[PDB]
Design a protein around this nucleic acid. Structure first.
Ligand SMILES: Nc1ncnc2c1ncn2[C@@H]1O[C@H](COP(=O)(O)OP(=O)(O)OP(=O)(O)O)[C@@H](O)[C@H]1O
Ligand SMILES: [Mg+2]
Ligand SMILES: [Mg+2]
Length: 1700
RNA sequence: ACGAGUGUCGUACCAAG
RNA sequence: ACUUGGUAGUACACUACU
């Protein structure tokens, strides 16, 4: 306010450098504003200015008689008080715009002062005076106060504070860190969350164990720290300062002792030289031979690929009947004697229709038009290519031999009949990869496959990919087009396509089979056939398909045999090759079907821009990797990454990893081949450590124009013969891990493995860990005094304003609001319930197979597989549990009065003491790792308590609040680059400053990429106790309650899942050393107590904070050690959950770099160990120039990412929800790959493959059943929107910027160019849109009118519903016009309490009518889902009406949906009902895709399109958003310039993207404010939401949405004659869904791009983005007609030259 | 045979003769 | 063991971080 204060604030702003200081300045500015307003208001009220007066002082002033000890004043600290006429007024000053903080403060003060008002028999009136800073208006809630002061005027001015805040925000606007550090600074009040503490915490056995471990002074320090109150104390930091001073001596001694070790370093670290790799390999081989059964016989090999293939015959015909006759005659003529020759000959005999081909065809057609076999000549025909076994034509012994031994059908004994001798005990059998003969055989197989499959298929390439995207691919890169065409020419492509098609045909006929029948499956190849043997229905649970491949070939040895052949036999006119029978499940068949796209993607990714590589060599490896559906290759791909990276690194423990953990699993020959490849790569990795080089650095004191790694091909290729660049080397290292064959774990074994892992960790902790604290870096211990001192220092540094920190934590996480407003407490995720659930789970008696659990009554009983009923009788101490949904659990708890309308933090504090005994269960994640990770599911109450703890710990972390731990943002890729920049500059200036005097000072760049081993499983949870006691933003009662919760959490019990217990109860033989039985008291109970494991991912943020403290200690040690050498050091540490990236830049001359590297690595390990952490030797390594943070690379300043992992995943993962959904996910993945550096041609190839695979899945290819070309006014698929099963037509720049909306934008831009007058062809898009008024609607074409009608009535409006919208919320509508139905699992819904309530209300006289009218009179319950108890419970019951909502709660197994798209292509699956509503299978709909097309076209033709409609389209698709306008202008006004080579890359976000955002808030917040008609809501800034609501109201008014809704409602009411609740509710739902979709379309999540140059303006970003995506080999300088809106070498270990 | 596995599994199930 | 008849929609599946 005064001159000195304002200039001091200016000085602080100008001298501010970090975001934390800016946040402190903002807090100080807010406090100064509040103080100014309070002083001026006190002047107006003629009362003495008091601020933050303790309530006890108030009472003593008004009641001096009462002793202060007698009265227990509330722990509030009111701003002011006024006691007159026996009335006490409590006055609080507020300078906020919203009234939410005032309401919260009033409620809290009222409920905390009512007690003391009652005891003293004096009324206490709570009055909050709030001034609005922009309108200067006073708001007073109290009517008595307003009577007592009739007129209050405060003529003041807040302009100075506004300008100061504006300057501060301008200086820090482009900092994302600053924006979210001051996001929720609306101060409500400071009050404890609970009135009382937890006295029984001090008597907890866990607390007593924790206390007895520490020394007596530490016990006293902890006791006084828990009891310290930072709000009544004279200073908030007295406790922290005292404890820091106490621990300072030992902390300094530890730091000095660690730093002095630099002189004791020997310089010898763990270098990955070839001798070390050889020793590790020998130890690994010994370990594997110990743990596996090693076979040197080639007959023991498993199929590398489960297919045998041969080339087709051009002479023969591809007719099915002729192929069948040829196959029968070839099978009948098998020559020689063999085990199954008679069976095969008889099988051919019983399918030889002979001369009666016409009768066979007519019988098959008659069957198709409309089962008893029909006797064709020596054939019993049941269907097309289905034949019954003829017992007259085959001998019984041969039939049994063929069905039992060859196919494994009925050979085994049933589980009930199995004896002890029937059980097999043996180690898994794998091939000897070291054996020279085995490797030679694998090499022979690879060479033979390359010989056969390299030949041309003889057919001209013609397919969907070429016909749809060949021009774009050729324009982006002609070399990519040539490579793809050569791939299409080869026999690799024909073989893999034949395998995929034959697999689809085998699956399509796997429904109706009988034991005495077999089927023939064919493909486009006339020489390849499949015999399908009887099995269970494929749609059933865990069903398998069993088949054998037969190939006819004229010349022997022309058969493709990847270890699958059974035999080759001479037959009439050639040879017939038969493979062994193969059983596969649904997921492996899905992998086979989707293999061709993966093969193409892998081939094009590996061959991209590498003339040294040979395409045939790449294809030979890619066909084996793409068609690998077994664990053998998964056991090799992931270890290869870490092994090769660690052998490449300067220092790593790769030898120990190979010796102890690397376990190759080689059951196939390709596994032996790949193992040899990995061994050679690891051997040669350290040899080429020398051949990596650095670019010359062009820096000009303001930016570094050129940097990175030289793109010279001197490294040896890993999987192929050839040479690669370092980037290509890393790509070859990392891509094979992303050949994701997920879902290959079997629960039978993986559940036991996970249980064994958890229980073994728990046992090792139970018996081998006796001490908690240590000073010698003992494993799983913490240095107590170092931990305490570090926590004190970091808490002091991060708690500048403790009141505002507490307020921000409360505001961000909705502590003072209802539980129903938290997303994680109302979600559809799973949680656990403990209780009696016999009825839910129990849905001729059997005896258990295990002999230990059989009573004398059950001795004479049939053995059966264990179920829940059988498990109940076996276990005495069985704790019953069930899994439910989170929202259902919340509904049940609210219904049973466990949870109330109280603020959520009060309920959490209550539950921390009420809920004492915790339960968890586990399941397998199902990831592509060779060993799966376990995932723990807990209860609702555990979720509440952990929510409170994690939200407290999250604020102090440096992590971005709005991102998840599971998916780190790409912004890290930028941050790393920034760090590298400084570490380069620091290296340049320090070396030049020290060498100016000239024994020469030398530099060193060190980069530690580390992961922690068993981050949650092996941790000291006790170290977090001190984190809560020392926290200065917590009251003592809150600390006691949280510590009580943590003590109870250390006593948690893991529940073993029922499936695992079923597995263990069916064994019949005891396990020799059964850890599971030992932990469960010989299966007495299903619960095991877990003490030191905090569970997978429950404490991410707390652990991250402690990890950051450990890195701070490491930095301190390094700085002191370098100070001992009188050198310069720069340490930068990036910390994620357990991932670390530490960069060290050192300039010194005392000693050699090797000693410094050894010392730094030893100190890193010791610093991790001192805090209870251990570095993972599998993922920890040290380099000079390669930074590896979470999946992101920095190659000496150049950002880098393996973008192929985004492409491959798009092929690999499919949810099979629907055509448009799958296409949208794949296109989003392609856009993500583009942002990460994908060349344009590869992106176009990815998009083409995505479209082709989507069309294959849903029969949308040209000429197929769901082909939409004939139903719509379109000549090509390009003319149909992708939402209507069309293909995407948009420039790659548009896809990169606006992914899914690119099609509509590009169509609108094309329409503008076609109908814009010639004088305005090249102008701003605003000027061209203005002339749309001059367009003639009759001049438009049918396609243009049809697409414009879609845009007007289906995008900007809701004229036709994709599904039944009753029960849907405002966000459930998407962009999908046609949506297939999915599963609605009846078992999943029967487990929901709220679902039973919904059924009860549905079967009631008029309950649903009352619910609908309640929803209608409160329409914001459609946008929200309830903000209190009653509204949430009504909204849940209403939401149960939605069929789409019940499908979201159901199980959508991707394999079952994949076979659904194969078996039931013609089934109606679409719920399409025209314009605004004008035993059955599990999945069923109203109409099919073609019927949907016809109804959609018929209803579109009835609509009317006018000029005003086109104006509305152009105004609210393009003109509304600054981004869309910018993109349109860039496309229209683009001029490409001179070509330029791509040399260096930079990470850049679109500059000033905040000015390109129309709506600041999220769609949910905007819709909440609009539906409630209030600008200020819980998580919104009132001023910004005012203009957001202005924009939304403009959209609603100009498009006549509400007026048309009212007219429709009135017309319907007139037609019916009475008010219709359902119609009006549906109309409101449609209106809110349209508003939500508009607001969502407004926002674009532009993020970090990798671009050839740095961008400083929005135009620069657009030009770089556009010029980058034209050609692969080079990029163009792009200009716009109008506005769119001296060399020196450095003396360092990584040698480099700077051109300054 | 095939899938899985240094954990006994899948390799359809039931009834009648 | 073999013959005939009947039955069978999913891994009833999944979390902590938005
Ligand atoms: N899928 C997940 N679900 C829950 N928490 C997870 C998940 N993935 C990672 N986390 C959390 O992040 C941490 C890091 O786990 P990560 O996969 O890096 O390995 P780790 O468990 O530390 O073990 P290791 O390095 O020995 O394999 C976990 O300990 C857990 O807290
Ligand atoms: Mg880890
Ligand atoms: Mg990690």
């Amino acid at each position: 306010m005064d001159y000195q204060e304002y200039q001091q604030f200016l000085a602080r702003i100008n001298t501010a450098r970090d975001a934390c200081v800016a946040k402190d300045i903002d807090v100080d500015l807010l406090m100064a504003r509040k103080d100014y307003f309070g002083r001026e208001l006190c002047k107006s009220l003629n009362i003495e200015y008091r601020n933050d007066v303790p309530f006890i002082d108030i009472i003593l002033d008004i009641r001096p008689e009462v002793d202060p000890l007698t009265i227990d004043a509330p722990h509030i600290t009111p701003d002011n008080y006024l006691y007159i006429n026996n009335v006490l007024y409590i006055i609080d000053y507020k300078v906020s715009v919203s009234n939410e903080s005032s309401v919260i403060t009033y409620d809290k003060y009222y409920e905390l002062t009512r007690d003391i008002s009652d005891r003293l028999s004096i009324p206490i009136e709570i009055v909050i005076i709030r001034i609005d800073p922009v309108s200067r208006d006073l708001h007073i809630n109290s009517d008595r106060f307003k009577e007592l002061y009739p007129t209050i005027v405060v003529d003041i001015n807040f302009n100075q504070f506004f300008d100061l805040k504006q300057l501060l925000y301008e200086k820090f606007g482009d900092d994302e860190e600053f924006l979210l550090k001051v996001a929720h600074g609306d101060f409500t009040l400071t009050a404890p969350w609970c009135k009382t503490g937890c006295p029984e915490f001090w008597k907890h056995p866990i607390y007593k164990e924790f206390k007895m471990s520490m020394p007596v002074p530490e016990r006293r320090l902890f006791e006084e720290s828990v009891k310290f109150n930072a709000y009544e104390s004279e200073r908030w930091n007295t406790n922290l300062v005292k404890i820091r001073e106490y621990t300072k001596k030992d902390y300094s001694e530890h730091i000095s002792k660690s730093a002095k070790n630099i002189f004791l370093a020997s310089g010898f670290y763990k270098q990955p030289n070839k001798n070390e790799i050889s020793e590790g390999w020998t130890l690994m081989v010994e370990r594997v031979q110990d743990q596996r059964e090693i076979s040197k016989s080639l007959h023991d090999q498993k199929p590398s690929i489960h297919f045998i293939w041969g080339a087709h015959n051009p002479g023969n015909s591809n007719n099915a009947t002729f192929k069948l006759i040829l196959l029968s005659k070839s099978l009948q003529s098998i020559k020689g004697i063999s085990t199954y020759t008679e069976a095969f000959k008889s099988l051919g005999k019983m399918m030889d229709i002979g001369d009666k081909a016409i009768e066979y065809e007519e019988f098959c057609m008659s069957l198709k038009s409309k089962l008893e076999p029909k006797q064709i000549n020596n054939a019993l025909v049941l269907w097309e290519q289905q034949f019954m076994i003829n017992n007259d034509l085959i001998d019984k012994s041969e039939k049994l031999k063929l069905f039992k031994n060859f196919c494994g059908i009925g050979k085994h004994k049933q589980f009930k009949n199995k004896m002890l001798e029937d059980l097999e005990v043996s180690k898994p059998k794998i091939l000897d990869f070291d054996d020279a003969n085995m490797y030679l055989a694998s090499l022979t197989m690879m060479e033979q496959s390359k010989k056969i499959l390299s030949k041309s298929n003889g057919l001209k390439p013609d397919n969907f990919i070429l016909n749809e995207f060949g021009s774009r691919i050729k324009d982006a890169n002609k070399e990519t087009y040539d490579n793809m065409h050569k791939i299409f020419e080869t026999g690799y492509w024909q073989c893999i396509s034949d395998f995929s098609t034959l697999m689809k045909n085998i699956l399509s006929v796997s429904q109706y089979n009988r034991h005495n029948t077999f089927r023939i499956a064919m493909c486009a190849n006339n020489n390849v056939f499949a015999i399908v043997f009887p099995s269970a229905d494929i749609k059933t649970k865990k069903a398998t398909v069993v088949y054998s491949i037969i190939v006819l070939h004229k010349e022997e040895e022309n058969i493709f045999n990847p270890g699958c052949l059974h035999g080759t036999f001479k037959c009439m006119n050639g040879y017939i090759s038969i493979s062994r029978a193969i059983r596969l499940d649904k997921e492996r068949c899905q992998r086979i079907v989707s293999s061709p796209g993966l093969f193409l993607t892998t081939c094009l990714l590996f061959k991209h821009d590498n003339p040294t590589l040979v395409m045939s060599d790449i294809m030979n490896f890619s066909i084996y990797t793409s068609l690998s559906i077994t664990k053998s290759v998964l056991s090799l791909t992931e270890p290869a990454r870490y092994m090769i990276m660690n052998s490449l690194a300067i220092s790593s423990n790769v030898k120990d990893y190979i010796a102890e953990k690397f376990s190759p699993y080689t059951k196939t020959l390709f596994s032996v081949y790949m193992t040899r490849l990995i061994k050679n790569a690891c051997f040669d990795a350290y040899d080429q450590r020398q051949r990596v080089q650095l670019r010359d650095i062009y820096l000009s004191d303001y930016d570094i124009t050129q940097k990175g790694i030289k793109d010279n091909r001197e490294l040896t290729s890993i999987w192929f013969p050839g040479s690669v660049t370092l980037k290509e080397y890393l790509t070859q290292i990392y891509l094979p891990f992303y050949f994701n064959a997920k879902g290959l774990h079997e629960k039978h074994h993986v559940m036991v493995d996970l249980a064994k892992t958890i229980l073994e960790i728990e046992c090792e902790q139970r018996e081998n860990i006796k001490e908690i604290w240590s000073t010698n870096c003992t494993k799983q211990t913490v240095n107590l005094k170092i931990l305490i001192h570090s926590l004190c220092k970091n808490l002091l540094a991060d708690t500048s304003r403790h009141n505002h920190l507490r307020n921000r934590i409360e505001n961000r996480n909705n502590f003072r609001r209802s539980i129903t407003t938290i997303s994680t407490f109302t979600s559809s995720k799973s949680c656990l319930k403990i209780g009696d659930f016999r009825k839910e789970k129990e849905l001729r008696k059997m005896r258990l197979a295990n002999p230990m659990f059989v009573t004398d009554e059950q001795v004479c009983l049939e053995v059966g597989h264990c179920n829940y009923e059988m498990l109940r009788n076996a276990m005495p101490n069985y704790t019953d549990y069930i899994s439910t949904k989170v929202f259902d659990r919340l509904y049940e708890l609210l219904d049973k009065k466990v949870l109330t309308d109280k603020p959520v933090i009060e309920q959490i504090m209550d539950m921390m003491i009420d809920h004492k005994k915790f339960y968890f269960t586990f399941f397998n994640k199902g990831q592509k790792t060779s060993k799966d990770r376990e995932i723990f599911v807990g209860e609702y109450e555990a979720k509440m308590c952990m929510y409170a703890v994690e939200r407290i710990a999250k604020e102090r972390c440096k992590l971005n609040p709005d991102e998840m731990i599971s998916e780190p943002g790409d912004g890290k890729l930028k941050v790393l680059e920034q760090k590298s920049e400084q570490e380069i500059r620091f290296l340049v200036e320090t070396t030049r400053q020290k060498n100016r005097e000239i024994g020469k000072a030398k530099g060193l760049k060190m980069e530690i990429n580390a992961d922690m081993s068993k981050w949650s499983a092996q941790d000291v949870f006790y170290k977090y106790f001190w984190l809560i006691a020392l926290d200065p933003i917590l009251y003592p009662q809150e600390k006691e309650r949280i510590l009580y919760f943590m003590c109870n959490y250390m006593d948690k019990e893991l529940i073993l899942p029922d499936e695992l217990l079923f597995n263990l109860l069916d064994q019949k033989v005891a396990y020799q050393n059964d850890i599971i039985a030992t932990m469960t008291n010989q299966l007495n109970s299903n619960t095991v107590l877990i003490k030191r494991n905090w569970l997978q991912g429950n404490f991410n943020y707390t652990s991250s904070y402690v990890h950051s403290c450990a890195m701070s200690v490491y930095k301190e040690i390094l700085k002191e050690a370098i100070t001992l050498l009188d050198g310069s050091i720069l340490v930068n540490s990036l910390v994620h959950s357990d991932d670390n990236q530490t960069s060290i830049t050192i300039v010194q001359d005392k000693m050699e770099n090797d000693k410094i590297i050894d010392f730094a690595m030893k100190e890193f390990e010791r610093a991790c160990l001192t805090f209870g952490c251990q570095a993972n030797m599998k993922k920890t390594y040290v380099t000079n120039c390669i930074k590896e943070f979470v999946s992101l690379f920095n190659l000496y300043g150049e950002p880098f990412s393996i973008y192929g992992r985004f492409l491959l995943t798009s092929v690999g993962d499919c949810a099979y929800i629907g055509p448009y959904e799958d296409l949208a996910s794949r296109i989003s993945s392609a856009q993500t790959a583009i942002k990460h550096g994908c060349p344009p041609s590869l992106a176009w190839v990815s998009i083409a493959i995505s479209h082709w695979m989507t069309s294959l899945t849903y029969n949308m290819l040209p000429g197929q059943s769901n082909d939409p070309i004939d139903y719509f006014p379109a000549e090509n698929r390009k003319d149909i929107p992708i939402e209507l099963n069309g293909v995407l037509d948009a420039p790659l720049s548009m896809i990169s910027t606006v992914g899914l909306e690119s099609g509509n934008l590009y169509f609108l831009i094309k329409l503008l160019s076609k109908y814009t007058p010639v004088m305005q062809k090249r102008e701003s898009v605003v000027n061209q849109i203005a002339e749309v008024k001059n367009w003639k609607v009759e001049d438009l074409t049918d396609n243009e009118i049809f697409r414009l009608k879609i845009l007007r009535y289906l995008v900007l409006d809701a004229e036709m519903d994709p599904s039944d919208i009753m029960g849907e919320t405002s966000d459930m509508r998407g962009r999908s016009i046609l949506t297939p139905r999915k599963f609605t699992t009846a078992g999943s819904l029967r487990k929901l309490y709220s679902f039973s309530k919904y059924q009860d209300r549905l079967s009631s006289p008029g309950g649903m009518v009352e619910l609908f009218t309640y929803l209608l009179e409160k329409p914001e319950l459609l946008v929200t889902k309830g903000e209190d108890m009653k509204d949430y419970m009504e909204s849940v019951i209403f939401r149960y009406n939605s069929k789409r909502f019940k499908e979201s709660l159901s199980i959508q197994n991707p394999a079952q949906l994949f076979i659904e798209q194969i078996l039931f292509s013609h089934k109606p699956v679409i719920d399409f009902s025209g314009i605004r509503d004008k035993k059955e299978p599990d999945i069923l709909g109203k109409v099919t895709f073609t019927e949907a097309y016809r109804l959609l076209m018929r209803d579109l033709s009835s609509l009317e399109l006018t000029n005003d409609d086109i104006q509305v389209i152009y105004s609210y698709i393009i003109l509304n958003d600054p981004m869309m306008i910018t993109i349109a202008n860039t496309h229209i006004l683009s001029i490409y310039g001179s070509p330029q080579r791509r040399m260096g890359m930079s990470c850049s976000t679109m500059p000033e993207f905040r000015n390109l955002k129309l709506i600041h808030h999220s769609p949910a917040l905007v819709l909440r404010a609009y539906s409630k008609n209030n600008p200020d809501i819980q998580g919104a800034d009132p001023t910004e939401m005012a203009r957001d609501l202005v924009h939304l109201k403009e959209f609603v008014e100009n498009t006549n949405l509400e007026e048309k809704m009212k007219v429709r409602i009135a017309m319907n009411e007139a037609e019916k004659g009475q008010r219709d609740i359902v119609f009006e509710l549906k109309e409101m739902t449609r209106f809110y869904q349209v508003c939500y979709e508009y607001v969502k379309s407004t926002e674009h999540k532009i993020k970090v791009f990798i671009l050839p140059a740095k961008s400083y303006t929005t135009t620069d970003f657009c030009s770089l983005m556009q010029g980058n995506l034209i050609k692969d080999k080079e990029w163009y300088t792009v200009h716009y007609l109008k506005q769119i809106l001296e060399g020196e070498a450095i003396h360092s270990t990584p040698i480099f030259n700077i051109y300054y």
